[PDB]
Amino acid sequence: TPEDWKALAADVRSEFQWAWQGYVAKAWGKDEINPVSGTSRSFFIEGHDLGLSLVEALDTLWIMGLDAEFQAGVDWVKANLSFDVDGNAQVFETNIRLVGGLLSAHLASGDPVLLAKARDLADRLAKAFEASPHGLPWRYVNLRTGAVSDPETNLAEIGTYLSEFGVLSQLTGERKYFDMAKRAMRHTLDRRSKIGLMAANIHAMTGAFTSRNASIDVYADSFYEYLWDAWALFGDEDCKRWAVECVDAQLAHQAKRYDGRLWFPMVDFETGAVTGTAQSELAAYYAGLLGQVGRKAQGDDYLASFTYLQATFGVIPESIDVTTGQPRRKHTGLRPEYPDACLNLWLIDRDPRYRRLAAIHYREMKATSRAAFGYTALKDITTRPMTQDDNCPGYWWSEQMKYYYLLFSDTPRIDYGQLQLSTEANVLRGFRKV
Numbered sequence: 082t083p084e085d086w087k088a089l090a091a092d093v094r095s096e097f098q099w100a101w102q103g104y105v106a107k108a109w110g111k112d113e114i115n116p117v118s119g120t121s122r123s124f125f126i127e128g129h130d131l132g133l134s135l136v137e138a139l140d141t142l143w144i145m146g147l148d149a150e151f152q153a154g155v156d157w158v159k160a161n162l163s164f165d166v167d168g169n170a171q172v173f174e175t176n177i178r179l180v181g182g183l184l185s186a187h188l189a190s191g192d193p194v195l196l197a198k199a200r201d202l203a204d205r206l207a208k209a210f211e212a213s214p215h216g217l218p219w220r221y222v223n224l225r226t227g228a229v230s231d232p233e234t235n236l237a238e239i240g241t242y243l244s245e246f247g248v249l250s251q252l253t254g255e256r257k258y259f260d261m262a263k264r265a266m267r268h269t270l271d272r273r274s275k276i277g278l279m280a281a282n283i284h285a286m287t288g289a290f291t292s293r294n295a296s297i298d299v300y301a302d303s304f305y306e307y308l309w310d311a312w313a314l315f316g317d318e319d320c321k322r323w324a325v326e327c328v329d330a331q332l333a334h335q336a337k338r339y340d341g342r343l344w345f346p347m348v349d350f351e352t353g354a355v356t357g358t359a360q361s362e363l364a365a366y367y368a369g370l371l372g373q374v375g376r377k378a379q380g381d382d383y384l385a386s387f388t389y390l391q392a393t394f395g396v397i398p399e400s401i402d403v404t405t406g407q408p409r410r411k412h413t414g415l416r417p418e419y420p421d422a423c424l425n426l427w428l429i430d431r432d433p434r435y436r437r438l439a440a441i442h443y444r445e446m447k448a449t450s451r452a453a454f455g456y457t458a459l460k461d462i463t464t465r466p467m468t469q470d471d472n473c474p475g476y477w478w479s480e481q482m483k484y485y486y487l488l489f490s491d492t493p494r495i496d497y498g499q500l501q502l503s504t505e506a507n508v509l510r511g512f513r514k515v
């Protein structure tokens with residue numbers, strides 16, 4: 082019997098609503114639910130929650146037509162969410178989760194307050210960029226005082242702002258946000274090696290690399306996405322060029338086959354020598370990026386490596402050794418990157434193969450991560466049953482349930498031709514209001 086995709090979408094929505102109910106019951110206004118114990122935890126600042134999962138969920142709720150739930154969350158934000166807080170926040174996470182989550186909710190709803198709050202937060206984060214003579218953000222900033230800490234940063238944490246900041250520039254009319262984000266990316270791109278790679282670790286004050294390791298995953302992932310995404314969102318010609326150049330350098334110097342499968346281990350950014358044997362599950366986003374930038378055959382080949390892991394292990398291991406294709410770790414983070422790739426590749430040609438693969442992933446999530454009050458990360462994927470930890474990461478609310486729903490629902494609330502997703506799956510273009 083052919084899969085009824087619409088029924089599967091309805092199941093995703095049902096499960097999401099059920100999870101939301103658990104969040105409301107156990108963790109209202111708190112950063113994350115621990116759905117086994119039925120408790121909450123903080124994410125950014127211990128004891129000073131910022132409604133993380135609520136904010137992350139908003140655009141997902143809207144897309145699913147969970148309008149009452151969406152509005153309850155928006156109304157909570159409008160009444161309660163403030164960033165005048167004497168505590169340190171990680172700049173990267175704060176941007177991709179809270180600035181981006183408020184922006185997608187703003188674009189869905191039109192509510193000016195959500196933009197006001199996104200912009201307030203971005204202005205607090207801007208102090209981290211201003212504290213570097215290179216415009217490379219420090220990793221942490223005090224939201225109230227602007228004090229910075231930890232300049233030993235990385236490509237992802239200096240280069241995952243341009244989508245949110247660029248949308249802020251579009252909406253506000255102030256180019257400063259776009260410029261600040263682009264300047265940081267240009268810094269490292271200008272320091273590419275002769276073979277076109279960047280090391281993944283960089284110092285905000287010296288502006289120099291602090292390792293020799295080029296990476297597509299750990300320390301770097303979304304830098305490469307945001308180059309393409311800035312072309313797509315803003316028509317930025319430099320970013321279009323850079324996106325393709327960076328990917329072609331990776332395909333030339335980091336693509337390696339082991340036991341017939343494509344992997345992208347870390348390499349020395351100048352010599353191209355392999356410097357590591359680990360690949361993170363997190364790398365799976367890159368299969369989708371490869372398609373986006375016009376390297377779809379390679380993207381499908383890379384997806385196939387992860388499809389192998391899913392078929393073999395059920396849940397994709399958090400990290401594997403590329404030389405053996407086996408797990409390096411037994412726990413998971415309830416990770417979304419496989420359906421991320423499936424959606425991104427499916428948006429190119431609408432091949433139902435990607436739906437089939439994502440349906441496996443969704444069903445496996447249901448079979449392994451369901452707990453009393455929501456969905457949880459795993460302790461051990463090698464036991465049967467797989468043992469659970471007790472945490473629903475904030476990104477679950479923005480990412481995989483949205484990916485599944487977008488893959489299966491064909492919702493009229495999204496213009497699929499105009500759809501743009503941040504690295505946290507915040508929708509930054511493509512809402513079709515009712």
Ligand SMILES: OC[C@@H]1[C@@H](O)[C@H](O)[C@H](O)c2nccn21
Nearest residue numbers: 302303363416417476504505
């Ligand atoms: O696993 C999802 C999380 C999210 O915060 C987001 O997708 C982000 O791009 C990322 N990089 C590595 C891990 N993650």
Ligand SMILES: [Ca+2]
Nearest residue numbers: 303366504505
């Ligand atoms: Ca991502």
Ligand SMILES: [Ca+2]
Nearest residue numbers: 306502503504
């Ligand atoms: Ca992407």
Ligand code: NA
Nearest residue numbers: 137140182479
């Ligand atoms: Na979101």
